[PDB]
Point group: D2
Chain length 261, copies 4
């Protein structure tokens, strides 16, 4: 159907994109980057992230495919040499779609802004000390003092979540995971420490205690928010759809990226 291709912008990725476009010209494939049904990302995981946010308002109409030009990307699971075979299989169709959960961040002021994340959503202070009350389904759970917090999707658990001590979570689990960044823990201040895994329909809310300015980052897009009254986290109802042409299981993907390949 309709398709488009984003590139990292370097020489290698642009040429691959041009060759794939020329290969798509030899089928009934129309290039359309306004209402594509197939979005192809050529680059790394960052490039795939940019492609996701570029089309986040049409997630139900789009299937994503990643090609990695450098080393294996977690979302870009195709080597450049397989691009010709990918063009052919994609042209025919009859591929199966695979869906991963997403995370919804809502920021309220004193107005409401919402964001969608594929990796994670983190919160820090705008300079001063970060102090927030953590409220789970309207129950006050803890007062957090430290560098910040990170709320991860399942496919995000192998990213920033992993470096903060979080657990790696299979993407068929509709959940989100909260991890701490350097929390204070003494006789006066104490947090849970452990990562927390939340199911669908649970709401985690952050409430300022003193400072109301926070730096919020959704998939490394970092925005300063002033006069913040609440940050709410929940598993989104929207999902990202991947076009898959062969078996590449998640735990094998994890093995290749972290153990050996």
């Amino acid at each position: 159907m309709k398709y488009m291709i984003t590139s990292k912008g370097d020489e290698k990725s642009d040429l691959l994109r041009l060759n794939m476009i020329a290969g798509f010209g030899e089928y009934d494939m129309e290039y359309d980057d306004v209402e594509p049904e197939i979005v192809i990302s050529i680059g790394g995981d960052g490039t795939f992230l940019s492609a996701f946010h570029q089309y986040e308002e049409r997630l139900d109409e789009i299937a994503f495919i990643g090609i990695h030009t450098g080393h294996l990307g977690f979302y870009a699971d195709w080597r450049p040499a397989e691009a010709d075979k990918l063009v052919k299989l994609l042209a025919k169709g009859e591929y199966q779609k695979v869906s991963y959960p997403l995370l919804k961040t809502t920021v309220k002021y004193g107005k409401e802004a919402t964001y969608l994340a594929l990796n994670e959503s983190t919160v820090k202070s705008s300079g001063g000390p970060f102090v927030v009350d953590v409220v789970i389904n309207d129950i006050h759970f803890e007062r957090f003092r430290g560098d910040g917090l990170c709320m991860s999707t399942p496919s995000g658990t192998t990213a920033y979540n992993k470096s903060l001590g979080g657990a790696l979570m299979h993407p068929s689990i509709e959940a989100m995971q909260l991890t701490e960044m350097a929390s204070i823990n003494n006789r006066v201040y104490r947090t849970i420490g452990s990562p927390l895994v939340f199911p669908k329909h649970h709401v985690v809310s952050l409430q300022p205690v003193n400072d109301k300015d926070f730096q919020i980052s959704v998939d490394h897009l970092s925005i300063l928010h002033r006069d913040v009254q609440e940050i709410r986290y929940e598993v989104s109802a929207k999902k990202i759809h991947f076009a898959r042409f062969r078996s590449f299981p998640f735990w094998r993907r994890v093995h290749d990226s972290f153990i050996e390949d």
Copy 2:
């Protein structure tokens, strides 16, 4: 209906059991510890664990209730002073049942033995070095060298799993979580490090590399197994049912047990 009561065995718990029995005599409640429909545990989490394994062959016919005589137990969420009010509400009935996932361990030899866990199932070596290949859905994932491994249920994540760096997982998530015990990690030997969370129908298998003798512990019941060929982990199809009479959410339970109460 039919019911029975287990006690920690100390003076305080025995007297509470006797008083509850006398209180049950004033209703249409028959004491039966062969085919009870209600099992009451008076003691700590250990006592509740013993009650679970005592009746693990009738989990679908039984609802559990825990009373804690010492401090708050995670499974024993009733104070002794509320025992009279518990007798009354239980006598009427019309309570709602709450189900938690369980973990199935299978041990093969050179014959098959299976176990059911409510907290976790761990594996260590019988003295020599512990070395196992970790296989996920028939895919070889890693070779583990270290002290041992721990596979946790959701309600178990606040137990041994928590002390090994695992994530705390809400019990409505049908999953199991694998955590490492002091793994070797240098240029020659390397593991994933991070905890792993597996959904229903995923099978994690441990395969010996050299030594075939392992000490396997299911809910602190520790058994030596010789001539072991495989240990398989998967989320059980069986579930434990709790009788609940009021709202005591999991994250509030976690807050009380770890933050403050």
Copy 3:
């Protein structure tokens, strides 16, 4: 001899300062905040830190004493009710001095600036990704990718170092300790992970790989540095001297601050 007193600035601390000054008027004690020999800090650990940096150019001529107005501070080990007994013992003299090691940070450009730390010296990126080569005594040790790094004094190991997984180190050990902040670790990027403890005369140097702008914080005083060519860490030759009037051992101080008091 000569003395001065810094206060947190709230009502409670100002009144305590005024009362101690009036008590010092009844001895041969001259108030002098230009060349004091005794510096008294009334507040928390932050107030003590400010007092240290206010007089860092006369460390060999000054002994410090901390009074904590809120909860126990690690450096402020005197309760306000003991202020009168402290005035008396200090007026007589014949107290013993205790010395803690300090950390020297040197920043080079493309010029040289040096800083002295009592808790720690940390480095982050000015927004972009933080990537530095870590060089130990002119040996290239690792390339670090992550949120940042923290170099701690011994008395600092119970502060930020503690929240990043570092070890707690007795202050009689002339050393410094380096800990990571959320490092990337996969098949392509890998760091040591473990904290590193360095003796006197060892030099740890950070060298930029791409971005040359870093946010450097010495005892929570955070400064942006542009066009950075090198950050060098080493145990200082200067030491801070505490006046002590009774036995309050470090591990007891640690017990009171973290286990129970």
Copy 4:
């Protein structure tokens, strides 16, 4: 002078030993495994550990050298191909000696046994729960509940200590480091969590609370001790001496063993 050579016992190591002996026959070198002045270990770190304990009663009269037949050992820093050049340099002499601190474990009963460790000394329970009071210089510091504890030398910090979260410590620092094994931490039971680094002349003592049987392991030599009244740890006055023929710094050794080589 006098010398002897221990081998791992496999074919490769025995032949190397025989060739080195024949090479030593061509100098004024007498083979003597009763009172050697030079001890050569051919194998891995385990083989070097066995050589250390074989001659622990003559540490001041002996210099050690390790040759690694498999991958790089931390104590065995010579490749087999350099054995001929090692024979020659050792025959001449005029080499410089390098000393590493050691750890002294003392076990008291209801009699006294002492052990010397080069890597570490650990303590576990003989089956039941491990519960000990931790006393630092006669000050009660904490009650530990968990799997066990590990007290490490500096050169041991890259071994078991590393896998338990401890810090890596340069061997010129006369110290010992204590790390936890899976400690219980909730509202009722709490430990320090962080590793602890102790200087020379500090004494750490473990005192049983209930069970008095402990499994104590000194450099992987594991002994059951019954009727235990106290386990005392302190930096030994004895030191191990290494013969060094060229610069191979500790942090380079660490880089090669963990980052890349």
